Structure formats: C-alpha cells, structure tokens
Symmetry: C3
C-alpha cells in the first residue's frame, strides 16, 4: 500500500526520519528548512532551525531532540 504523505511545497526533500510517535521529519533541502508532519496530520510544521544552507540529513533521538546536517555550513545543529 503506497501512500503519499500530505507535506506541502517540498523542494528536493532529502533526509528523513521518523520518531516513536510516527511523526515524519524531512530535510527540505531546496527550502533550507526542516519540516515535521505528525501522524495523521495534514499540516506540516517548519521547525525553528535558523541559518541552514542546503540541509541534507535529519535524525531524531529518543527524547525528541532533532539533529540536522547543515551541509553547506559544514556543521551539525541540534534543536532541543
């Protein structure tokens, strides 16, 4: 059963992660942002990272912290 998740206006999405609650996180590379879609939701949320330049990878730990590879700034950023 293939389903398309109701994200909005993605622009070359690259990294993705899924947490224990079924929320899906996407490094929306072409929009320099990380978006999150809760399970069952139709409205995605742009997370409050700042200063990203072509973010590639996203990861989420067991306590809900979100990590992104900010590729063109050669750094890894954590949002708590």
């Amino acid at each position: 059963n293939q389903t398309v998740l109701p994200f909005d206006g993605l622009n070359y999405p690259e990294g993705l992660a899924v947490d224990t609650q079924g929320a899906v996180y996407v490094a929306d590379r072409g929009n320099n942002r990380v978006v999150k879609l809760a399970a069952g939701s139709k409205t995605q949320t742009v997370l409050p990272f700042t200063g990203l330049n072509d973010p590639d990878g996203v990861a989420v730990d067991n306590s809900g912290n979100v990590y992104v590879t900010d590729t063109d700034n050669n750094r890894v950023v954590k949002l708590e």
Copy 2:
C-alpha cells in the same frame, strides 16, 4: 571493528539507508530509482514495491515496519 560488505546487488549511487529493529538494512538506490532491502543473514536483496520513484534519496523505517522514502525529484514523501 571488523568491516563487512553487505551482499546488495547492482547498486548505482546508493544514498540513504536505514536499519530496523531486526537488523534488516534498507537502501535508497538512487541511481536505479528503487529502494532495496537486505534482511539480516539474507544473500539476495528484495526490491520494495514503491512505484514512480525518481532519484529517491532518504529512507526511514518505523517501529511497526512501515517504510518511508523521500522521492526527491517528485518533491514528495512516500510511505509503504
């Protein structure tokens, strides 16, 4: 600290990968527009029955075994 090459076949620019709770490894074989899976101990990958992928980049797997992929060039996230 022993390195092993896993017995995937015919990969073309493999990009994202994920590993589930049972040790199965999922790979976004971007250059072949497919997602392949090698169960722990298996010798032959399976090709997951996604449709219409184009330069898929990221893969993730949730606790219930659902597989999520960033279909980059189609600006969408697909769930199996």
Copy 3:
C-alpha cells in the same frame, strides 16, 4: 525550548547523512573527508570509525546493537562495522 546548538564536531567537509543512537551519540557521514565520525553526547571528543576505503560516503545508520552501516556511494556498496 527550541534552543539551537552547534555540535562540536571538528573539520567536517560537506557532512551528509547522520544518525543518533540510543545513548545520544551522533554519527556523521563526513562525505568530503571519506570518513564517518562519532560524537558522544556532551563530549569534546570525536571518533573516526575504522571504515576503510570509503569514497564519498553519504548515508549512515546505527542499529540497537551498536553496529554501524554506511553507504559508500561512489563505490556502489554498503559496508557494516561490527
């Protein structure tokens, strides 16, 4: 709290994939340096994992047993450590 912090990795060069394990250690596919680097939570120490012969690795994953997996993209292969 939405506080943003830059993790104290050293010398990354176009980092791509990342993973976090159950202890909070962060693993990065440091693509431009053909290496995978690990930073334990709160540490000032990064560890270069003993993968060999990588070429532009892009993806990294870590399983519950601590085994580490990397897509060695330009070598068209997936390698496992442990």
